[PDB]
Amino acid sequence: DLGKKLLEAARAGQDDEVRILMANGADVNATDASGLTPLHLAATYGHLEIVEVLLKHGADVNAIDIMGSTPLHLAALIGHLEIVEVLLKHGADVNAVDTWGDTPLHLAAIMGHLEIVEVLLKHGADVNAQDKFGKTAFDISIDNGNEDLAEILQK
């Protein structure tokens, strides 16, 4: 089973090994116990070029783990602007919702990734989507007193 080896290779950032495993038939869309795919772990650890090569080889860009997290969610949380852009250009759902009601925009606002915040807004992020507690991205901004975030969401 090479799928268990691709998952660890993407996480570590070994580009040549990922090419090796895919050529030998490894499951690009395998999952670990928590439903994470190699695309999830490449995006979470900022290994951009592994993300890129995976997309051109059939990876499911909207694959959700057992908590409903898409690769775009994890990229926005950790704050990887380029990978955020690459995912959106490869069919990522900008307003996907995990099991806590969070969209990616929810996560980029909470962590202060104001650059990624602007990107999501331009690419269709809904400013009206509520989490489980019923807070939009703007609702989050006024609560924690983030005037920089508030300005970006009003425009």
Binding site: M67, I110, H113
Partner: protein, 426 residues
């Protein structure tokens, strides 16, 4: 109550800890060579509080400089006052924590804590009547956070009848957009709740907002920020370093500022706000209570004041200060709790700091400080729910239960501030 053992740990702590000595040595007339070249007796009356006098009219700061990254000792030495510190107290490891709290608290830091405690005992034995311990550090890193809180706990064990006071820098994405800092702050706030008696909250979010929108600096550096930190630390230590009508010490502060043991997180403020390089009494009392002047990005008008201590510096009618301070408590009576009589205390100091001629420093125990802990906890919940980078902790020795417990203790603190925020007298 005379002697204080000042410690500075990690990159941030040593940076603000070195600025602290640079500003108070100037105030007390001490030069980079340890010589006293002042012209006032008021600078040496309580000079022993922070300085160990030596031979040849030398004054060595009672300071213990700690870090895991060996580079920090180099940046401190190349500073103007970088050779006044006793070389024996310099304790620096070889492998930094790399923004990992577990390395600071459990592995890399824990192998070096005995080297620091040995130094603490040396300085504490030279104390005729030691008050307690002081620390400057960050919460969002690995050394000042992880190792700093371990040191606070171990010193607590060997000197339980002394007071521990910390200067603690709260992380902000506006100054450091690193996602592991919510974990490290929450793990650090959990420790500060149990182990310290009083903690000053110096939030990098507030420092950024002050430098960027109030002072108009489009790209603040660690200089613009620490210019605010070192001034605050001058204010809240004034009545410890100069005679004054009160014999204020770390315990008299604690007993009258801390109504319940866990609510010892203060919100310091400073007036006037000013940038480096580049005022009547009713203005000073006004600006001192303004949200724009707080060193923690909380709006005090969203909560109530449990206790306040405000110190002025310079030449001004002490009678006018009394009238203005009584005026603030009459026109803002809905922001001070009614079930603590005479909960505001004022002191005036003759010698102002540098540059400025007037000074006003604010120390608040405000229920609005929950907004800070809410902001951090929101960032911690998002990271921890996705288990992001959690293996960087359990791989050092931690277990997942230490994350939930520090998280459980943090949100309790928010409920406690809200409770007393709604408590009435009737």
């Amino acid at each position: 109550m005379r002697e204080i053992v000042h410690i500075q740990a990690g990159q941030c702590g040593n940076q603000i800890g070195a600025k602290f000595w640079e500003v108070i040595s100037d105030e007390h007339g001490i030069d980079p060579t340890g010589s006293y070249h002042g012209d006032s007796d008021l600078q040496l009356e309580r000079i022993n509080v922070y300085y160990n006098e030596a031979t040849g009219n030398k004054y060595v700061p009672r300071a213990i400089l700690v870090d895991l990254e060996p580079g920090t000792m180099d940046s401190v030495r190349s500073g103007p006052f970088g050779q006044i510190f006793r070389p024996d107290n310099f304790v620096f490891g070889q492998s930094g924590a790399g923004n990992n709290w577990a390395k600071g608290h459990y592995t890399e830091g824990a192998e070096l804590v005995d080297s620091v405690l040995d130094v603490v005992r040396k300085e504490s034995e030279s104390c005729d009547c030691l008050q307690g311990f002081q620390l400057t550090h960050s919460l969002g890193g690995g050394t000042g956070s992880g190792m700093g809180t371990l040191l606070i706990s171990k010193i607590r064990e060997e000197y339980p009848d002394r007071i521990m006071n910390t200067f603690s820098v709260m992380p902000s994405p506006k100054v450091s957009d690193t996602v592991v800092e919510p974990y490290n702050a929450t793990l650090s706030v959990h420790q500060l709740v149990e182990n310290t008696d009083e903690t000053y909250c110096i939030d990098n979010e507030a420092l950024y907002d002050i430098c960027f929108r109030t002072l108009k600096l489009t790209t603040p550096t660690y200089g613009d920020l620490n210019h605010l930190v070192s001034a605050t630390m001058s204010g809240v230590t004034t009545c410890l370093r100069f005679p004054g009508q009160l014999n204020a010490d770390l315990r008299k502060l604690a007993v009258n500022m801390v109504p319940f043991p866990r609510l010892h997180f203060f919100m310091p403020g400073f007036a006037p706000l000013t940038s480096r390089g580049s005022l009547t009494v009713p203005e000073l009392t006004q600006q001192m209570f303004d949200s724009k002047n707080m060193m923690a990005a909380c709006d005090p008008r969203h909560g109530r004041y449990l206790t306040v201590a405000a110190i002025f510096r310079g030449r001004m009618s002490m009678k006018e200060v009394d009238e203005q301070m009584l005026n603030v408590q009459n026109k803002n009576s809905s922001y001070f709790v009614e079930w603590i009589p005479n909960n505001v205390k004022t002191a005036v100091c003759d010698i102002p700091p540098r540059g400025l001629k007037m000074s006003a420093t604010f120390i608040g125990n405000s229920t609005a400080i929950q907004e800070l802990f809410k902001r951090i906890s929101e960032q911690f919940t998002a990271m921890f729910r996705r288990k992001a980078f959690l293996h960087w902790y359990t791989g050092e020795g931690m277990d997942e239960m230490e994350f939930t417990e520090a998280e459980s203790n943090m949100n309790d603190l928010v409920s406690e501030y809200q409770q007393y925020q709604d408590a009435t007298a009737d």
